[PDB]
Enzyme design. Structure first.
Site, PDB file in Angstrom:
ATOM      1  N   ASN A 189       0.805  -1.227   0.000  1.00 43.78           N
ATOM      2  CA  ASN A 189       0.000   0.000   0.000  1.00 43.78           C
ATOM      3  C   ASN A 189       0.842   1.282   0.000  1.00 43.78           C
ATOM      4  OD1 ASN A 189      -2.614  -1.282   0.015  1.00 43.78           O
ATOM      5  ND2 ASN A 189      -2.365  -1.656   2.202  1.00 43.78           N
ATOM      6  N   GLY A 232       4.252   1.301  -0.879  1.00 48.18           N
ATOM      7  CA  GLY A 232       5.465   1.099  -1.651  1.00 48.18           C
ATOM      8  C   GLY A 232       5.516  -0.112  -2.542  1.00 48.18           C
ATOM      9  N   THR A 233       6.436  -0.043  -3.505  1.00 46.01           N
ATOM     10  CA  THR A 233       6.705  -1.097  -4.468  1.00 46.01           C
ATOM     11  C   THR A 233       8.181  -1.411  -4.377  1.00 46.01           C
ATOM     12  OG1 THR A 233       6.888   0.550  -6.232  1.00 46.01           O
ATOM     13  CG2 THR A 233       4.744  -0.545  -6.012  1.00 46.01           C
ATOM     14  N   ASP A 293       6.920  -8.915  13.811  1.00 47.65           N
ATOM     15  CA  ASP A 293       6.495  -9.694  12.643  1.00 47.65           C
ATOM     16  C   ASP A 293       7.543 -10.736  12.197  1.00 47.65           C
ATOM     17  OD1 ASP A 293       4.621 -10.529  10.760  1.00 47.65           O
ATOM     18  OD2 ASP A 293       4.949  -8.838   9.386  1.00 47.65           O
TER      19      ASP A 293
END
Ligand SMILES: Cc1ccc(NC(=O)c2cccc(C(F)(F)F)c2)cc1-c1cc2cnc(Nc3ccccc3)nc2n(C)c1=O
Length: 256
Positions: A19, A21-22, A132
């Site tokens: 959402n 970044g790429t 995470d």
């Protein structure tokens, strides 16, 4: 510190999608040689100045964390969009690798998880809580070189009970996640608690139930997963204790 966009070449294929970044594979020109890198291009659709602040803060955080067992920062680049430049871990995530490379020796798996414990011991010492830690967030440089990365809805199957109940996140809740990571690794990247809902996992854990010992997993290693899965947070080891037990075992088993 700050890179010249002229020295950066980006491939048009995406290593990651998100959402904000790429991620694209690139090459950073360095005098004589060229270094392959992974590039987070800031997707600020959006359109806040605080999103750029976050990227710049992440860069500052990353600059402070310097250890061979973490995805390291090359630099920042301001071009058509803001870019965060990181070193490439060419084999991708540990879960997908192991799903495709069933020939990986359990000796090679001890080495990988020990490297993960080393990097997590580092983060623990720098008072940094991951939140995470999972196999998908462990990226391979080579088959013998693992690096810790960090790419609403939560990853409940890797969460400690005090995270689900009281939202208490610490290095000791990262230890619980490490135990789920170890299970995923000896299970050759198979999904933990397959087909269970997050709610089902919470109930199972409260009955004192834990995932079984993967096929071919050394007993000392499964004993360690179980200790990572201690329900009481005070009795649960920290990464100093985990890393030391994995180090000794690697010193005994892998020496050759
Ligand atoms: C491009 C990129 C930007 C930032 C990060 N961030 C972190 O690693 C990070 C942030 C906070 C804390 C920490 C911790 F200290 F806990 F470690 C890490 C990561 C990346 C990034 C790097 C990367 C390297 N290799 C690969 N390989 C790959 C190969 C095949 C398929 C898929 C991936 N991918 C990377 N990706 C996707 C990244 O996003």
């Amino acid at each position: 510190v700050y890179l010249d966009r002229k020295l950066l070449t980006l491939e048009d294929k995406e290593l990651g999608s998100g959402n904000f970044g790429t991620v694209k594979k690139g090459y950073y020109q360095m005098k004589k040689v060229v270094k392959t890198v992974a590039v987070k291009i800031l997707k600020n659709e959006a359109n806040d100045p605080a999103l750029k602040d976050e990227l710049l803060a992440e860069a500052n955080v990353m600059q402070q964390l310097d250890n061979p067992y973490i995805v390291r920062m090359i630099g920042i680049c301001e071009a058509e969009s803001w870019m965060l430049v990181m070193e490439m871990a060419e084999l991708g995530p540990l879960n997908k690798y192991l799903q495709q490379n069933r020939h990986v020796k359990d000796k090679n798996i001890i080495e990988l998880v020990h490297q993960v414990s080393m990097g997590m011991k580092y983060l623990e010492e720098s008072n940094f809580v991951h939140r995470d830690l999972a196999a998908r967030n462990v990226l391979l440089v080579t088959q013998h070189y693992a690096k810790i990365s960090d790419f609403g809805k939560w990853p409940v199957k890797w969460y400690a009970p005090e995270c689900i109940n009281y939202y208490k996140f610490s290095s000791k809740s990262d230890v619980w996640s490490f135990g789920v990571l170890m299970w995923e690794a000896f299970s050759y990247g198979q999904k933990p608690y397959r087909g269970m809902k997050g709610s089902e996992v919470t109930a199972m854990l409260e009955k004192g139930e834990r995932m079984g010992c993967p096929a071919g997993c050394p007993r000392e290693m499964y004993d360690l997963m179980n200790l990572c899965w201690t329900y009481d947070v005070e009795n649960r080891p920290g990464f100093a204790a985990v890393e030391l037990r994995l180090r000794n075992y690697y010193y005994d088993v892998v020496n050759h």
